[PDB]
Design an enzyme around this catalytic site. Sequence first.
Site, PDB file in Angstrom:
ATOM      1  N   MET A   1      -9.133  -1.899   8.514  1.00 13.19           N
ATOM      2  CA  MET A   1      -8.604  -2.166   9.873  1.00 13.19           C
ATOM      3  C   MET A   1      -7.808  -1.054  10.545  1.00 13.19           C
ATOM      4  O   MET A   1      -7.318  -1.259  11.648  1.00 13.19           O
ATOM      5  CB  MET A   1      -7.764  -3.457   9.884  1.00 13.19           C
ATOM      6  CG  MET A   1      -8.516  -4.681   9.393  1.00 13.19           C
ATOM      7  SD  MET A   1      -7.536  -6.200   9.229  1.00 13.19           S
ATOM      8  CE  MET A   1      -6.999  -6.503  10.907  1.00 13.19           C
ATOM      9  N   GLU A   2      -7.708   0.123   9.927  1.00 14.36           N
ATOM     10  CA  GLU A   2      -6.914   1.205  10.483  1.00 14.36           C
ATOM     11  C   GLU A   2      -7.550   2.574  10.470  1.00 14.36           C
ATOM     12  O   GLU A   2      -7.179   3.409  11.292  1.00 14.36           O
ATOM     13  CB  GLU A   2      -5.592   1.361   9.729  1.00 14.36           C
ATOM     14  CG  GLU A   2      -4.658   0.170   9.795  1.00 14.36           C
ATOM     15  CD  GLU A   2      -4.941  -0.873   8.754  1.00 14.36           C
ATOM     16  OE1 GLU A   2      -5.402  -0.533   7.624  1.00 14.36           O
ATOM     17  OE2 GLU A   2      -4.680  -2.042   9.065  1.00 14.36           O
TER      18      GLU A   2
ATOM     19  N   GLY B   1     -12.420  -3.298   1.936  1.00 13.80           N
ATOM     20  CA  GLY B   1     -13.493  -4.190   1.542  1.00 13.80           C
ATOM     21  C   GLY B   1     -14.720  -3.369   1.212  1.00 13.80           C
ATOM     22  O   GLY B   1     -15.207  -2.606   2.047  1.00 13.80           O
TER      23      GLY B   1
ATOM     24  N   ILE C   1     -12.771  -9.094   7.143  1.00 14.14           N
ATOM     25  CA  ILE C   1     -14.152  -9.518   6.977  1.00 14.14           C
ATOM     26  C   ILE C   1     -14.272 -10.450   5.765  1.00 14.14           C
ATOM     27  O   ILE C   1     -13.805 -10.126   4.661  1.00 14.14           O
ATOM     28  CB  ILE C   1     -15.085  -8.313   6.831  1.00 14.14           C
ATOM     29  CG1 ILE C   1     -14.876  -7.353   8.008  1.00 14.14           C
ATOM     30  CG2 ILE C   1     -16.534  -8.755   6.788  1.00 14.14           C
ATOM     31  CD1 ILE C   1     -14.890  -8.004   9.366  1.00 14.14           C
TER      32      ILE C   1
ATOM     33  N   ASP D   1     -11.840  -6.132  -2.675  1.00 14.66           N
ATOM     34  CA  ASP D   1     -12.722  -7.263  -2.393  1.00 14.66           C
ATOM     35  C   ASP D   1     -14.031  -6.723  -1.815  1.00 14.66           C
ATOM     36  O   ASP D   1     -14.114  -5.544  -1.462  1.00 14.66           O
ATOM     37  CB  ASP D   1     -12.072  -8.224  -1.399  1.00 14.66           C
ATOM     38  CG  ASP D   1     -11.872  -7.595  -0.028  1.00 14.66           C
ATOM     39  OD1 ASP D   1     -12.843  -7.581   0.772  1.00 14.66           O
ATOM     40  OD2 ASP D   1     -10.754  -7.094   0.217  1.00 14.66           O
TER      41      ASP D   1
ATOM     42  N   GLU E   1       0.785  -1.223   0.000  1.00 17.34           N
ATOM     43  CA  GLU E   1       0.000   0.000   0.000  1.00 17.34           C
ATOM     44  C   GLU E   1       0.826   1.287   0.000  1.00 17.34           C
ATOM     45  O   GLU E   1       0.291   2.342  -0.342  1.00 17.34           O
ATOM     46  CB  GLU E   1      -0.979  -0.008   1.175  1.00 17.34           C
ATOM     47  CG  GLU E   1      -2.039  -1.090   1.057  1.00 17.34           C
ATOM     48  CD  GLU E   1      -2.853  -1.239   2.325  1.00 17.34           C
ATOM     49  OE1 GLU E   1      -4.079  -1.472   2.248  1.00 17.34           O
ATOM     50  OE2 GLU E   1      -2.256  -1.124   3.417  1.00 17.34           O
TER      51      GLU E   1
HETATM   52  C1  LIG Z   1      -4.282  -8.940   6.642  1.00 22.94           C
HETATM   53  S1  LIG Z   1      -5.535  -7.714   6.501  1.00 22.94           S
HETATM   54  C2  LIG Z   1      -4.891  -6.054   6.435  1.00 22.94           C
HETATM   55  C3  LIG Z   1      -5.975  -5.054   6.034  1.00 22.94           C
HETATM   56  C4  LIG Z   1      -6.412  -5.340   4.621  1.00 22.94           C
HETATM   57  N1  LIG Z   1      -6.597  -4.023   4.017  1.00 22.94           N
HETATM   58  C5  LIG Z   1      -7.934  -3.449   4.288  1.00 22.94           C
HETATM   59  C6  LIG Z   1      -8.990  -4.395   3.793  1.00 22.94           C
HETATM   60  C7  LIG Z   1      -9.274  -4.806   2.489  1.00 22.94           C
HETATM   61  N2  LIG Z   1     -10.303  -5.713   2.469  1.00 22.94           N
HETATM   62  C8  LIG Z   1     -10.733  -5.950   3.740  1.00 22.94           C
HETATM   63  C9  LIG Z   1     -11.768  -6.761   4.398  1.00 22.94           C
HETATM   64  N3  LIG Z   1     -12.597  -7.574   3.684  1.00 22.94           N
HETATM   65  N4  LIG Z   1     -11.836  -6.698   5.753  1.00 22.94           N
HETATM   66  C10 LIG Z   1     -11.021  -5.906   6.483  1.00 22.94           C
HETATM   67  N5  LIG Z   1     -10.067  -5.109   5.975  1.00 22.94           N
HETATM   68  C11 LIG Z   1      -9.927  -5.116   4.629  1.00 22.94           C
HETATM   69  C12 LIG Z   1      -5.543  -3.170   4.589  1.00 22.94           C
HETATM   70  C13 LIG Z   1      -5.516  -3.590   6.040  1.00 22.94           C
HETATM   71  O1  LIG Z   1      -6.417  -2.736   6.773  1.00 22.94           O
END
Ligand SMILES: CSC[C@@H]1CN(Cc2c[nH]c3c(N)ncnc23)C[C@H]1O
EC number: 3.2.2.9
Lengths: 231, 231
Positions: free
Chosen positions: A173-174, A78, A152, A197, A12
Amino acid sequence: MKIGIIGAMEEEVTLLRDKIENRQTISLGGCEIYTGQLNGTEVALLKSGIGKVAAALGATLLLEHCKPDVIINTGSAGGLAPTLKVGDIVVSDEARYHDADVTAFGYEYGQLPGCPAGFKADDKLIAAAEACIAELNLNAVRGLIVSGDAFINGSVGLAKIRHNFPQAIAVEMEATAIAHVCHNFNVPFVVVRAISDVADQQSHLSFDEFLAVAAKQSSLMVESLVQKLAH
Amino acid sequence: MKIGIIGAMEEEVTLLRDKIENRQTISLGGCEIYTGQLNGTEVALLKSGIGKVAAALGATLLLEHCKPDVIINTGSAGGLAPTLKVGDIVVSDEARYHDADVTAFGYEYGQLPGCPAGFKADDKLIAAAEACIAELNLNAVRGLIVSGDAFINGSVGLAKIRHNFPQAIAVEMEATAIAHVCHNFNVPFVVVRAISDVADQQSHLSFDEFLAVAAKQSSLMVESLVQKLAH
Ligand SMILES: CSC[C@@H]1CN(Cc2c[nH]c3c(N)ncnc23)C[C@H]1O
Ligand SMILES: CSC[C@@H]1CN(Cc2c[nH]c3c(N)ncnc23)C[C@H]1O
């Protein structure tokens, strides 16, 4: 003017890191901060690591050591809103924790005591991001981004988010940790991420496949936004 | 030698704050740090606010601005181990997130990528805490403390923790964030908290009633531990 940029994963931050001229690297507290000029504008780019605490640690260091004027959170997300396809852009008007629950004491679901229920992104940063989206003819959605320490992957995890935050446009997640730290230091922020995704049963396979395209589109937006802000 | 002490709530830091001689107050990032001598030993006491991100922000500031040699996390906790009554002491051998889930990518439940699955507290701090417990004839349990951004109040929230972490002795909302930040700065930590409630249906009523007794017992332990460490 100095622009702070935060991403979690190497994928990223690498495109932006590459573009920085006269790059210097600071290593502190398990994170890395790269400073220099991005198309002539002074930036500080943080690679935080994954999740709320890693983001909070990193953002705190960035604010203390570099004193950026604004924070842009970049990376993947996501997609939850129905018009989002892989690669599309999400812009926060607000960030909330999807996993915080102190409702036993009458706080709103997602709210921590001492905090607003949601952290609002800066109007001027939102407007600047939307003008970049227009100029680049990207498909984007603006709205609520929710964060937690979970990836998720459909099933009950997705269902809980759709139930508690039906208005949420994306999950990651941040972002909310960064928003919280910015709120406490009174620094403007905006989240500009791209879809990797749709947070369903296939999200683990899609993420791997389309992280690169999400990193590319978000990085393109951050570049355009930095240029726009520098004017 | 300088000892860092972190508590989340005013109730949890006030007894110690009162005892500090030549007290100075630093206000930064929405938290407060009090410095001075506690029974002759130089301390920096942080009031962080509630939850993982508030704790992470606070601990990062404390480590950067004050450079304490060790960190002690004090305050209240929800008791999970069956011999714990209100007021009793819990000492971390380890801290884990009960609410982190990246199992879609094969991480252990509770583990974030880039982190160990659990953060181990310092052996010498554990030993010093246990010797204080002995000297004060307190009832205590040593073991796993789990943290998340939720106040546990029986029902499905408690059930999920008992299912995923049957070995967990207590639950609260900051300890693991503090442990994570200490891990990333390579600073020793220990959690020494006291029981306010048993995280069941009655926990919201019990907490209010017995927070004072939990703050008193944990503060007594932190004082004794600081003295023990100074020797
Ligand atoms: C090993 S995970 C690290 C996270 C993945 N990225 C965000 C993200 C994309 N799809 C997602 C989803 N379905 N659920 C939650 N997070 C995300 C970056 C980091 O926050
Ligand atoms: C408004 S809550 C702020 C938290 C309460 N304290 C820990 C704690 C005691 N009982 C608990 C329980 N049943 N579930 C979770 N946490 C705790 C301090 C802070 O972490």
